């Protein structure tokens, strides 16, 4: 006879249920379901009367306190993941305790009594809204973490597309015991949303400043590119794995900025090639002693960087158009910049009006450069579509040397054999043959002094190189001299020898030592 029973439910559970459930879930279920019995009981044996709109209306507000209930517990326990964790977890690369075992179980129960009583799932919006601001906040407070302990916010960057990856890895298996199957794609692609958008617009404020720094001309701050860049494309296939099932509006994010990465990459690759190639070839920013430049210095280290991440580079020009295929393209953009690099050295070289001196000029950066590409891997790089590129350069500067060498032909032309008479006569120096030789010394003199005087000034920083020059010249100057000054000197020719000859062979090449050395 306990159909009496149901008359009294109402009065006997208003109290527990108007308290709530906190810390009595099961208890406030199972009043819950005492409710929920009677409320069938009513309904099948005496429809519209006003137990069964009590007990309805019970049951109603039972129901609101459940919804309130699962919403405090994620309110109360979802925490943010601490940086020094975050690190290990990254550092380790695995498959987190984010409730405590007790609340897990209320949050999973209440899911589950919802989702078979209730009205609506407003309570799984809840569930990514909580979830996804402590995810967005455990990613910005790992980077505050680096910027507490330049290549920090690369550093920091790197680790947070990480840290991304393995706590959205993390959610999806907490949102896996929580959202019914159904829901749970996309109630995931909600839950990530502000993390993954705060991950994206970190990377393009990132290509914002490297567009920034190349328009100053600026870039080092654009290597660090190539370093993100790298990441990206080495962890998008995580990416892909914990976004499957998601929005193709979602899936789409990370390669929109592996894009944009790419082609502020390109970008800067080609502005550099540029800016080498259109460098100012007036007066003001050449050297006054001929001596390696600026620009060269910078383009042979701005190459030397991009060793270090070849693929990356590669793939990058690649992407604005296979692996052997980005190494030639690699290669090719290097080429351009060097090929940029001596074209314009050329164009600078006619800066000065002394022809010798723009061979020096060409023949000291044509020699950094050709000892470069032998400091570094650089010529490997250039030899992939540049076979003999490194017999060239050695050619030119041996030219330029030549070229060089053809300032002192105005000296020894005095001196030389052509200069001569064919006959080597001694009857006696006649007032022609004495005049000749005075013309000459004194021809050869002024000459020599007038050239060291000029090309004292004059630098060859590679003294190895320096040396190999001076040698050349004295052997050249100092044989001819020489056999002029036994031939002609020795002979009299004037009551005033010191005002002609006025060098000994040794003497002169020490003129020369002394040249290509300031001071």
Same mark, same amino acid.
């Given at each position: 006879?306990?159909?009496?029973?149901?008359?009294?439910?109402?009065?006997?559970?208003?109290?527990?249920?108007?308290?709530?459930?906190?810390?009595? !879930?099961?208890?406030?279920?199972?009043?819950?379901?005492?409710?929920?019995?009677?409320?069938?009981?009513?309904?099948?044996?005496?429809?519209?009367?006003?137990?069964?709109?009590?007990?309805?209306?019970?049951?109603?507000?039972?129901?609101?306190?459940?919804?309130?209930?699962?919403?405090?517990?994620?309110?109360?326990?979802?925490?943010?993941?601490?940086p020094?964790?975050l690190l290990?977890?990254?550092?380790?690369?695995?498959?987190?305790?984010?409730?405590?075992?007790?609340?897990?179980?209320?949050?999973?129960?209440?899911?589950?009594?919802?989702?078979?009583?209730?009205?609506?799932?407003?309570?799984?919006?809840?569930?990514?809204?909580?979830?996804?601001?402590?995810?967005?906040?455990?990613?910005k407070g790992l980077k505050e973490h680096f910027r507490k302990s330049l290549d920090v916010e690369t550093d920091a960057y790197i680790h947070c597309?990480?840290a991304?990856?393995?706590?959205?890895?993390?959610?999806?298996?907490? !949102?896996?015991?929580?959202?019914?199957?159904?829901?749970?794609?996309?109630?995931?692609?909600?839950?990530?949303?502000?993390?993954?958008?705060?991950?994206?617009?970190?990377?393009?404020?990132?290509?914002?400043?490297?567009?920034?720094?190349?328009?100053?001309?600026?870039?080092?701050?654009?290597?660090?590119?190539?370093?993100?860049?790298?990441?990206?494309?080495?962890?998008?296939?995580?990416?892909?794995?914990?976004?499957?099932?998601?929005?193709?509006?979602?899936?789409?994010?990370?390669?929109?900025?592996?894009?944009?990465?790419?082609?502020?990459?390109?970008?800067?690759?080609?502005?550099?090639?540029?800016?080498?190639?259109?460098?100012?070839?007036?007066?003001?920013?050449?050297?006054?002693?001929?001596?390696?430049?600026?620009?060269?210095?910078?383009?042979?280290?701005?190459?030397?960087?991009?060793?270090?991440?070849?693929?990356?580079?590669?793939?990058?020009?690649?992407?604005?158009?296979?692996?052997?295929?980005?190494?030639?393209?690699?290669?090719?953009?290097?080429?351009?910049?060097?090929?940029?690099?001596?074209?314009?050295?050329?164009?600078?070289?006619?800066?000065?009006?002394?022809?010798?001196?723009?061979?020096?000029?060409?023949?000291?950066?044509?020699?950094?450069?050709?000892?470069?590409?032998?400091?570094?891997?650089?010529?490997?790089?250039?030899?992939?579509?540049?076979?003999?590129?490194?017999?060239?350069?050695?050619?030119?500067?041996?030219?330029?040397?030549?070229?060089?060498?053809?300032?002192?032909?105005?000296?020894?032309?005095?001196?030389?054999?052509?200069?001569?008479?064919?006959?080597?006569?001694?009857?006696?120096?006649?007032?022609?043959?004495?005049?000749?030789?005075?013309?000459?010394?004194?021809?050869?003199?002024?000459?020599?002094?007038?050239?060291?005087?000029?090309?004292?000034?004059?630098?060859?920083?590679?003294?190895?190189?320096?040396?190999?020059?001076?040698?050349?010249?004295?052997?050249?100057?100092?044989?001819?001299?020489?056999?002029? !000054?036994?031939?002609?000197?020795?002979?009299?020719?004037?009551?005033?020898?010191?005002?002609?000859?006025?060098?000994?062979?040794?003497?002169?090449?020490?003129?020369?030592?002394?040249?290509?050395?300031?001071?």
């Amino acid at each position: 006879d306990h159909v009496i029973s149901y008359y009294h439910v109402a009065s006997d559970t208003e109290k527990i249920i108007r308290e709530g459930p906190t810390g009595r !879930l099961e208890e406030y279920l199972g009043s819950m379901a005492k409710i929920q019995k009677a409320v069938e009981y009513f309904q099948d044996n005496s429809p519209d009367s006003p137990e069964l709109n009590k007990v309805k209306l019970l049951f109603e507000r039972g129901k609101e306190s459940l919804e309130s209930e699962f919403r405090s517990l994620m309110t109360r326990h979802s925490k943010v993941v601490s940086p020094v964790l975050l690190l290990d977890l990254i550092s380790a690369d695995d498959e987190l305790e984010h409730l405590p075992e007790s609340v897990l179980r209320d949050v999973v129960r209440i899911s589950r009594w919802l989702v078979e009583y209730g009205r609506n799932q407003d309570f799984m919006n809840v569930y990514y809204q909580i979830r996804s601001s402590q995810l967005d906040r455990s990613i910005k407070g790992l980077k505050e973490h680096f910027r507490k302990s330049l290549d920090v916010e690369t550093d920091a960057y790197i680790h947070c597309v990480s840290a991304f990856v393995k706590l959205a890895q993390s959610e999806y298996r907490l !949102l896996m015991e929580i959202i019914p199957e159904h829901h749970q794609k996309k109630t995931f692609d909600s839950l990530i949303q502000d993390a993954l958008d705060g991950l994206m617009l970190e990377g393009e404020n990132i290509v914002s400043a490297a567009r920034k720094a190349i328009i100053r001309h600026d870039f080092s701050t654009v290597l660090t590119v190539f370093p993100i860049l790298r990441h990206l494309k080495q962890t998008k296939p995580e990416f892909d794995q914990v976004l499957q099932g998601t929005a193709a509006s979602t899936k789409n994010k990370l390669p929109g900025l592996i894009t944009s990465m790419e082609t502020i990459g390109a970008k800067a690759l080609e502005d550099f090639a540029d800016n080498i190639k259109n460098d100012p070839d007036k007066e003001y920013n050449m050297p006054k002693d001929g001596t390696v430049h600026e620009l060269t210095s910078n383009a042979i280290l701005f190459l030397q960087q991009l060793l270090d991440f070849q693929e990356t580079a590669g793939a990058m020009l690649a992407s604005q158009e296979s692996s052997e295929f980005s190494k030639r393209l690699l290669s090719t953009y290097i080429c351009k910049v060097l090929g940029n690099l001596q074209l314009n050295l050329l164009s600078k070289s006619k800066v000065y009006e002394d022809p010798a001196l723009s061979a020096i000029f060409l023949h000291n950066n044509y020699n950094y450069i050709l000892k470069s590409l032998e400091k570094s891997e650089l010529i490997q790089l250039v030899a992939v579509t540049q076979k003999t590129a490194e017999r060239s350069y050695r050619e030119h500067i041996e030219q330029q040397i030549q070229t060089y060498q053809r300032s002192w032909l105005k000296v020894t032309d005095y001196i030389a054999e052509k200069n001569l008479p064919v006959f080597q006569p001694g009857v006696k120096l006649r007032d022609k043959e004495r005049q000749m030789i005075k013309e000459r010394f004194k021809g050869f003199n002024d000459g020599l002094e007038e050239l060291c005087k000029i090309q004292k000034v004059w630098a060859i920083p590679d003294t190895e190189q320096r040396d190999k020059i001076r040698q050349a010249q004295k052997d050249i100057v100092k044989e001819t001299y020489g056999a002029f !000054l036994h031939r002609y000197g020795s002979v009299p020719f004037t009551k005033n020898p010191e005002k002609y000859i006025k060098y000994r062979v040794e003497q002169v090449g020490d003129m020369i030592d002394r040249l290509f050395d300031t001071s």
